[PDB]
Write a protein that binds this DNA or RNA. Structure first.
Ligand SMILES: [Mg+2]
Length: 811
RNA sequence: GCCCGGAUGGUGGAAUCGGUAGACACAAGGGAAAAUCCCUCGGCGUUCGCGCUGUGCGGGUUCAAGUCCCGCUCCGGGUACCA
């Protein structure tokens, strides 16, 4: 055994070994309990960032630990490889998105190996290859044939009316919302975000006649109980009613054009009068900047007495404000300053007077419904999923338009529709749109023009978790047996910022696949763990020109007070720096830290250990070089204790019967430590305290004598235990130390240590004696003494009723 | 302005159970320039044994609150008129 620990001499040999033995490659083995540990797949930007390192170290810790518990563990890796950055890099360099992307995959793959992540590399996928995207193209054709796909012009952000393909995600909204109650092991924050994003709404559509106007006008309301307080209707700027009025009304015309471009209220009277269906009285119709064209019908019944936006519009333009709901105490409301918003009992409402809110809602709805001018309607904030982009670097959309004018899917025997990778980019137009020949094809015997827009990249990320189960299956999108063996994912790890995009889409996609017969479960992941951001100090100076210039913390020369807080700071050019604290990492604050640099400076194991020790997985992590150094020193001390132990040669069989009292207490701490680290990693997922627990045991182990045969036999049992406990975190050093300790086989398939129950029995326990809360004594008592026995030993104490067994007496 | 989180030593963080506050580590300081190693370290008071105090500020429950409830202050993050 070398005296010095040198990761440059250990890590790449161990990595090569994991590749040569295919250590982390797995199959669908029915004789073992499965565990699917998934980290959000990287985008191949060019190099790993510290967030990848954190995300993927947490997943690797869990994957390795679950393998040591005897489970069959799937930990897959792949590349979300289409998307926008590659077209910008292609143009800037003078290349193409494909070769740039594949070069990045190669470089980042080598980085992930250099971190020692135990992936099943046989299942590696890059989502830009036709072997991947072909199945989403087929799947999109099936969705279309099932009526879940349509095309429409919609406003994207300046503002454009762009045609797009939509998947009807709203067909599944109820279930996406309802099934959140199944998600016990997702965090409350992500669930609430999804609930609010979905925005389920129960209401009524109400249709109005409109004088001297060709069509009726339908509004959506969530408060039909306030119907007799409706003093005007309001319509979105883009509504066809406003469009019409706008032909004779230049005031309106300019308002409608103002709105197309650009929380104040703004509006123009359209001059149209709608007829109130109950009273029969005319009310004015206004165009209003606060009504969304895209939601509901894009028109509202305005009740300024009881909706604050309607109140502020009516106050500004002098429209009638009419009260129809009473205050909590049955008094008429004070509307002199703002709307009365709470649901109450109606007044000023004729036949509907005295009705409470639920009764009012129902009665006014029932009456409009029977009059043929209302109907109950559930709406959603959630929009349908717009899946097309006017971009080149993505999966082609499998639709065609025949010479006819007719629209249909690309035939089965013409899938995949292949994105050509050999292209020159002009910056301006997609190569498959710039070339008129590419879109020309033939379908059902006739000349067609095929779609040139491509899929948004969330299309590929919505199902990759499932394809990892059967990545080389050529017969379909999924081998249902393989997918149902591995799914649902046991734990999915990735940031909270994906909460209402990817983390909603993959739930939807899972359900589509369920309803196609492809999987047999309702949800794709049991547990979601959202790891915190990695932070770093940030500094700037102000130039003579008044501009802020940000300076990397490595270039900061800081000065620290008596208590170590930063009091001044300068750069080597002499600029006075202002310290802004720990801050999210960015190129803008110039405070990013390159994990490659750190891996080369300290070794992967040090970087992994620091990242798991510094803070709980779900909280923010403050990157501190003094902290990383501290981790490196710990591993060096573990290396030292093993070197000195093995230097003494082989070990006698431990004889538990003949152990000394000290020996017995020391062994007790080995086994308690095993029990805690197990519970911390396996159930609590408190990785930082699991490590602290190992460190506290080492501190004792470094003190134990090791001359007598038994002392050494005990250290052997301790160190075999420590090396295994540390292995999910620091597997390179631990792989090597296991061999030095002559552990059996490779550490990766060694059994996780189990605490010996015999080793942990206490002869005695300590009891704190308090008088009136404040501690006045401490006493040792048998782990079997009765109250009165305990309270008697209590009484005997010269300084010395509530009693917790084994813990506390308070008098 | 909304919805959802936070607040413990000089610092990151422990306290899982309402029951010994500060494990573990960093930073300091003392020990045998740099590096390693070993001991001290919440604040104040001290006759060096210890005493009083202490979890942003208030209050409620409790025999007992960092923990559970309710206010106030101050810190972060999402969401842009969804009728
Ligand atoms: Mg603090």
């Amino acid at each position: 055994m070398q005296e010095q620990y040198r990761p440059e001499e250990i890590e790449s040999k161990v990595q090569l070994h994991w590749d040569e033995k295919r250590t982390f490659e797995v199959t669908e083995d029915e004789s073992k309990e499965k565990y699917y540990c998934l980290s959000m797949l990287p985008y191949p930007s060019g190099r790993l960032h510290m967030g990848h390192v954190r995300n993927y170290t947490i997943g690797d810790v869990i994957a390795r630990y679950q393998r040591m518990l005897g489970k069959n563990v799937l930990q897959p890796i792949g590349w979300d490889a289409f998307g926008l950055p590659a077209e910008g890099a292609a143009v800037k360099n003078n290349t193409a998105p494909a070769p740039w992307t594949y070069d990045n995959i190669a470089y980042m793959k080598n980085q992930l190996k250099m971190l020692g992540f135990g992936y099943d590399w046989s299942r590696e996928l890059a989502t830009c290859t036709p072997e991947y995207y072909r199945w989403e193209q087929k799947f999109f054709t099936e969705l279309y044939k099932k009526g879940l796909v349509y095309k429409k012009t919609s406003a994207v952000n300046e503002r454009k009316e762009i045609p797009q393909w939509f998947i009807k995600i709203t067909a599944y909204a109820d279930e996406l919302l309802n099934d959140l109650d199944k998600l016990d092991h997702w965090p409350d924050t992500v669930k609430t975000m999804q609930r609010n994003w979905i925005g389920r709404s129960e209401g009524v559509e109400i249709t109005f006649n409109v004088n001297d106007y060709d069509n009726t006008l339908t509004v959506y309301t969530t408060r039909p109980d306030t119907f007799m307080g409706c003093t005007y209707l309001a319509v979105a700027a883009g509504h066809p009613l406003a469009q019409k009025a706008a032909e004779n009304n230049p005031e309106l015309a300019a308002f409608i054009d103002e709105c197309r471009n650009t929380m104040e209220k703004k509006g123009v009277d359209t001059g149209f009068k709608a007829v109130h269906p109950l009273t029969g009285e005319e009310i004015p119709v206004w165009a209003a900047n606060f009504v969304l064209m895209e939601y509901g019908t894009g028109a509202v019944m305005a009740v300024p007495g009881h909706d604050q936006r309607d109140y502020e519009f009516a106050s500004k333009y002098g429209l009638n404000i009419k009260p129809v709901i009473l205050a909590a105490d049955g008094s008429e409301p004070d509307l002199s300053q703002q709307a009365l918003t709470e649901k109450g009992v109606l007044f000023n409402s004729g036949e509907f007077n005295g009705l409470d809110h639920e009764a009012a809602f129902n009665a006014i709805a029932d009456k409009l419904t029977a009059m043929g001018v209302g109907e109950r309607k559930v709406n959603y904030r959630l929009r349908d999923w717009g899946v097309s982009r006017q971009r080149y670097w993505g999966a082609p959309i499998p639709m065609v338009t025949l010479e006819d004018g007719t629209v249909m899917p690309t035939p089965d025997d013409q899938l995949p529709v292949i994105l050509p990778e050999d292209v020159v980019m002009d910056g301006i137009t997609s190569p498959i749109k710039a070339d008129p020949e590419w879109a020309k094809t033939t379908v059902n015997g006739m000349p067609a023009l095929r779609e040139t827009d491509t899929f948004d990249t969330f299309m590929e990320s919505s199902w990759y978790y499932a394809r990892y189960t059967c990545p080389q299956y050529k017969e379909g999108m999924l081998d249902s047996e393989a997918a149902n063996y591995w799914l649902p994912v046991d734990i999915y790890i990735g940031g909270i910022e994906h909460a209402i995009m990817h983390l909603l889409y993959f739930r939807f996609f899972h359900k589509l696949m369920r309803d196609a017969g492809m999987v047999n479960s309702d949800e794709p992941a049991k547990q979601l763990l959202c790891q915190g951001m990695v932070l770093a100090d940030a500094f700037y100076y102000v130039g003579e020109n008044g501009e802020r210039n940000w300076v990397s913390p490595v270039d900061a020369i800081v000065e620290r007070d008596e208590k170590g807080r930063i009091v001044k700071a300068k750069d080597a050019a002499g600029h006075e720096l202002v310290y802004t604290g720990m801050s999210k990492m960015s190129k803008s604050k110039n405070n990013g830290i390159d994990p490659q640099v750190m891996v080369e400076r300290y070794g992967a194991d040090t970087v992994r250990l620091f990242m798991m020790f510094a803070s709980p997985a779900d909280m923010t992590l403050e990157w501190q070089e003094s902290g990383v150094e501290g981790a490196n020193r710990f591993l060096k001390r573990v290396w030292k204790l093993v070197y000195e132990h093995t230097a003494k040669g082989d070990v006698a069989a431990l004889n538990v019967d003949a152990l000394t009292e000290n020996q017995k207490a020391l062994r007790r701490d080995v086994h308690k430590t095993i029990a805690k680290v197990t519970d911390d990693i396996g159930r609590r997922q408190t990785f930082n305290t699991a490590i602290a627990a190992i460190m506290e045991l080492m501190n004792k182990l470094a003190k134990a004598p090791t001359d007598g045969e038994q002392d050494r036999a005990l250290m052997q049992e301790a160190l075999l235990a420590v090396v295994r406990m540390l292995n999910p975190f620091t597997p390179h050093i631990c792989f090597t130390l296991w061999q030095e300790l002559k552990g059996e086989g490779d550490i990766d398939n060694a059994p996780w240590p189990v605490a010996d129950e015999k080793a942990m029995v206490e002869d005695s326990t300590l009891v704190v004696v308090q008088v009136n809360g404040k501690v006045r004594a401490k006493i040792t008592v048998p782990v079997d003494a009765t109250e009165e026995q305990v309270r008697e030993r209590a009484g005997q104490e010269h300084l010395v009723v509530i009693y917790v067994p084994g813990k506390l007496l308070n008098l």
